[PDB]
Amino acid sequence: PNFVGRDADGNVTVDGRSYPMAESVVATESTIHRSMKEMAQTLANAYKTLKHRDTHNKGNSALAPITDENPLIIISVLKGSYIFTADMVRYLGDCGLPNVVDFIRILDNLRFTELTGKHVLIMEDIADTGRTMKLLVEKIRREYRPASLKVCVLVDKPGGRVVDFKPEFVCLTAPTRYVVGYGFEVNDRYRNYRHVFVLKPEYAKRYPSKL
Amino acid sequence: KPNFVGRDADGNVTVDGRSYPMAESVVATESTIHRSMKEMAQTLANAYKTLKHRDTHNKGNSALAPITDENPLIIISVLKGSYIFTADMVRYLGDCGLPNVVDFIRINLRFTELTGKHVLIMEDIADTGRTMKLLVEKIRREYRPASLKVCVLVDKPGGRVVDFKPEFVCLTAPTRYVVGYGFEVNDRYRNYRHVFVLKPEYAKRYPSKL
Ligand SMILES: Nc1nc2c(ncn2C[C@@H](COCCP(=O)(O)O)OCCP(=O)(O)O)c(=O)[nH]1
Ligand SMILES: Nc1nc2c(ncn2C[C@@H](COCCP(=O)(O)O)OCCP(=O)(O)O)c(=O)[nH]1
Ligand SMILES: [Mg+2]
């Protein structure tokens, strides 16, 4: 239960802390985690009874269920999705969905090599124009041809989509503005904030120097 | 708040009613781990609050600059196991008001302006110490930072056979193989909210390749 207000200077405050960069709040921490917990229940319901090719015992030719021996493959997209993935896989643990996480950069390579015929779920933190995920779903499809490939996003910005891509799973929806907080950044700043805000346009270019 | 630890009808470890058949014992529950990290967030905040390092945000200011949103503390997390530890930790550092940024290394960085900066490595385990001794020596050589300290989630000082000691330690464990909360056996059990001693029978349970 977070309390959103304004300080004496007119800056947005969440639970008494001032966020001078924020214009408004998109979702407080309680809203974000309430969404991810229901999302984990949704994913678990969508994947628990499924079957895919057994990479555990290479000698078995029948298709195996999703267990700790043949878990769900989760591809987290660096950089901003690591906080989202961290909370998410623990929620999937609560719903008892066995899973494994490998990371990719948008480019640093995957290290998993047994994706063919496997159920695969990519976890990105935002879809805006839809380009980044359209290229990623096409690349993974042709390099590995999994059994299923689906996208779960923390934040969908539908109003700014240019290509035609939809995430199968969406935690939050956001307005067509630049957001920061909880993985979203401005030159890596505000990534560790526990809520998602709309950034003041005056702050969009405040840290131009390269890290 | 505190997690309840017991045993089920078959002697398996239970935490809050959920059974963990691969576990031998519980090193630390989620609440113990989070109380520790929250106290480390205070400790790190007191250590870096008043420091100063090179001003890269305004390269025309030859004077040193405090740790701000313009020149934050550089934090290097190592992948993969330490990403969950890092995710919780940076948020705790947010509550303690310590401005920081995180880039990841695996054993490739993308940050390059580390010289004259305060840098802190986030790792989940220090046992023999070889992996961390190699990293600090290589970063001091290729970056010449102002300071370079190490914060680890679990320290196993009975296992060290090489000269290295982390300046910041959340938990101290015996010389045993742990799984849970970042720690794994062939990428399993990473997402469990607690840290368990692994049964030696489960050590070679998933030999196949991912
Ligand atoms: N911080 C922030 N970044 C945004 C946003 N929208 C797009 N981006 C850029 C981008 C966010 O990823 C860059 C941040 P990174 O994870 O640290 O590399 O989203 C891709 C949009 P696409 O699906 O049209 O390809 C936003 O609202 N806030
Ligand atoms: N799961 C698990 N792995 C352990 C453990 N100890 C060392 N390792 C291996 C290792 C960490 O494993 C790396 C695997 P990743 O983090 O998933 O990429 O730690 C080396 C410590 P040292 O070089 O200072 O001696 C342990 O207790 N549990
Ligand atoms: Mg490790």
Author numbering:
A (entry chain A): 9 to 114, 130 to 234
B (entry chain E): 8 to 114, 132 to 234
Sentences from the paper on this structure:
To explain the mode of binding of the ANPs, crystal structures of HGPRT-I in complex with compounds 1, 2, 6 and 7, and HGXPRT in complex with compounds 2 and 7 were determined. However, the structure of HGXPRT has not previously been determined. The structures were determined at resolutions that range from 1.76–1.99 Å for HGPRT-I and 2.26–2.64 Å for HGXPRT. The guanine bases in 1, 2, 6 and 7, bind in a similar fashion to HGPRT-I and HGXPRT, being held in place by π-π stacking interactions with F166/Y201 (HGPRT-I/HGXPRT) and forming at least four and up to six hydrogen bonds with the amino acid residues and a neighbouring water molecule. In all six complexes, a phosphonate moiety is located in the 5´-phosphate pocket. In HGPRT-I and HGXPRT, this pocket is formed by D117 to T121 and D151 to T155, respectively. Additional hydrogen bonds to the phosphoryl oxygen atoms also form with the side-chains of T118 and T121 in HGPRT-I and their counterpart residues, T152 and T155, in HGXPRT. For compounds 2 and 7, we have determined structures of complexes with both HGPRT-I and HGXPRT, thus allowing a direct comparison of the binding modes of these two ANPs. When compound 7 binds, the phosphonate attached to the linker binds into the 5´-phosphate pocket in both complexes. In HGXPRT the peptide bond between L86-K87 is in the cis conformation, with the side chain of the L53 rotated out of the active site.
